C-alpha cells in the first residue's frame, strides 16, 4: 500500500518536489527511472484518452499509464493548477476495488500536508529550499 515515488507539479513545468521513500540506502534505487515517468505524466494531462470532467465539485483520480512494472495515478486538482502524481508497483497492488478509496485517502493526505506546509507564515515568499526540507520531514514522518 506504500508508494514508490511521489511528485508535485505546479502550473508551470516545474516540480515542487520529487520525493522517493528510503533515500538512505541505494538498494538499486534509480531516481532517473522515476523522473522520466514524472516528465511524461505532465505530457499525458493533455491526452484525450483520459479526461477530468468538472461537473462534480470533488477532484477525481485517474490511471494514466503503467510502465516498468509501476502504475501511476494523476489527480489534477482543478482550481489552483497543482498536478500530483503518486506511483505504485504491481506487487504492492492487490488488484481489488476497496484499495481505490485508500489510494484517494493517500492523495488527500498528501494534499493536506502540502497546503499546511505552504501556508506556514514564517517562510519567506519565493521558492525556498525550506519548503522542500519541511515537505520531506513531514513525508518521512508519514513514510518510514
Amino acid at each position: 500500500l506504500r508508494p514508490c515515488f511521489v511528485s508535485l507539479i505546479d502550473e508551470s513545468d516545474k516540480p515542487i518536489l520529487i520525493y522517493v521513500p528510503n533515500e538512505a540506502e541505494n538498494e538499486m534505487n534509480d531516481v532517473l527511472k522515476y523522473n522520466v515517468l514524472s516528465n511524461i505524466s505532465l505530457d499525458y494531462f493533455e491526452s484525450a484518452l483520459v479526461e477530468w470532467h468538472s461537473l462534480d465539485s470533488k477532484p477525481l483520480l485517474k490511471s494514466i499509464f503503467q510502465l516498468e512494472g509501476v502504475s501511476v495515478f494523476a489527480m489534477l486538482i482543478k482550481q489552483t493548477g497543482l498536478k500530483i502524481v503518486i506511483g505504485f508497483e504491481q506487487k504492492s497492488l492487490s488488484g481489488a476495488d476497496d484499495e481505490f478509496e485508500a489510494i484517494n485517502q493517500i492523495f488527500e493526505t498528501v494534499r493536506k500536508i502540502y497546503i499546511r506546509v505552504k501556508c506556514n507564515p514564517l517562510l519567506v515568499s519565493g521558492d525556498e529550499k525550506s519548503i522542500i526540507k519541511s515537505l520531506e520531514r513531514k513525508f518521512d514522518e508519514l513514510f518510514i
Partner: protein
C-alpha cells in the same frame, strides 16, 4: 452541509482586524532607525503610543509616508487573502479552472463564500460593466459599525475611516493573485440608500 467544526469568538477577531491599522502605523513611525508612554519589564523597558493618537498621527502624516503605510496594509491583506483562498481550495468550488477567462464567475465565488467567511454575510449587490470593471456594493461594512463618528465633524471622520479599507483591497488582490496575476483594483464610497463601501476590479 451544516458543518459544526471548531470555532472562536467573532469579536476578538474583529477588534484584532481593527488594530492591524495602528500596528502598521506603529511599525512605520517606529522603524527604530535613529506624547508617548513607558512600561516596566524585568531589566527592560518598552515605550508605546495608544491607538487613537496614532490615527491622529495619520491625520498629521506626511504624504509620501502615507502611501508608504498603505503598501503595507495591502501587503498584509494580500498574504491573508492568498492563504485564505488556499484554504477555500479545500471547499472544491466547481466554478473555475485557472487564469479567470470568465471573470464574473469567480466574482460569483468571492461574494458568495469569501465575504461570507470573513464578515458573516454575502455581498448584497454586484453590478457588471463588461470591460472587466465590476461594481461591488455592501450597505454595512462590518468592521466600521463600531467606529463612532464624533459630533458634527464628519469631514475628519471620512478621512479617518477610509485608510481601514486597504485590508479588503488586500483580500481581493490576494485572492486574484492566488489565481495568477495582478491587475488594477481601487476603492469607492457609495453612500448607502436604506438604513457602505464599493470596490472596483479588473
Amino acid at each position: 452541509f451544516e458543518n459544526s467544526l471548531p470555532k472562536v469568538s467573532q469579536s476578538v477577531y474583529q477588534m484584532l482586524l481593527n488594530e492591524m491599522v495602528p500596528l502598521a502605523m506603529g511599525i512605520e513611525r517606529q522603524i527604530s532607525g535613529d506624547i508617548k508612554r513607558l512600561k516596566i519589564e524585568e531589566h527592560h523597558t518598552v515605550d508605546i503610543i495608544r491607538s487613537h493618537n496614532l490615527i491622529h498621527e495619520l491625520y498629521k502624516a506626511d504624504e509620501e509616508e502615507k502611501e508608504k503605510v498603505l503598501a503595507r496594509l495591502r501587503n498584509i491583506g494580500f498574504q491573508i487573502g492568498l492563504k485564505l483562498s488556499e484554504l477555500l481550495i479545500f471547499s472544491n468550488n466547481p466554478n473555475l479552472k485557472f487564469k479567470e477567462m470568465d471573470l464574473l464567475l469567480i466574482m460569483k465565488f468571492i461574494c458568495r463564500d469569501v465575504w461570507k467567511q470573513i464578515f458573516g454575510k454575502q455581498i448584497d449587490n454586484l453590478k457588471t460593466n463588461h470591460r472587466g470593471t465590476f461594481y461591488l456594493l455592501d450597505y454595512d461594512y462590518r468592521p466600521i459599525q463600531s467606529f463612532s463618528l464624533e459630533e458634527d465633524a464628519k469631514n475628519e471622520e471620512l478621512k479617518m475611516i477610509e485608510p481601514f479599507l486597504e485590508i479588503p483591497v488586500g483580500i481581493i488582490r490576494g485572492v486574484l493573485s492566488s489565481l495568477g496575476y495582478s491587475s488594477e483594483e481601487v476603492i469607492c464610497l457609495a453612500s448607502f440608500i436604506d438604513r457602505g463601501v464599493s470596490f472596483h476590479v479588473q
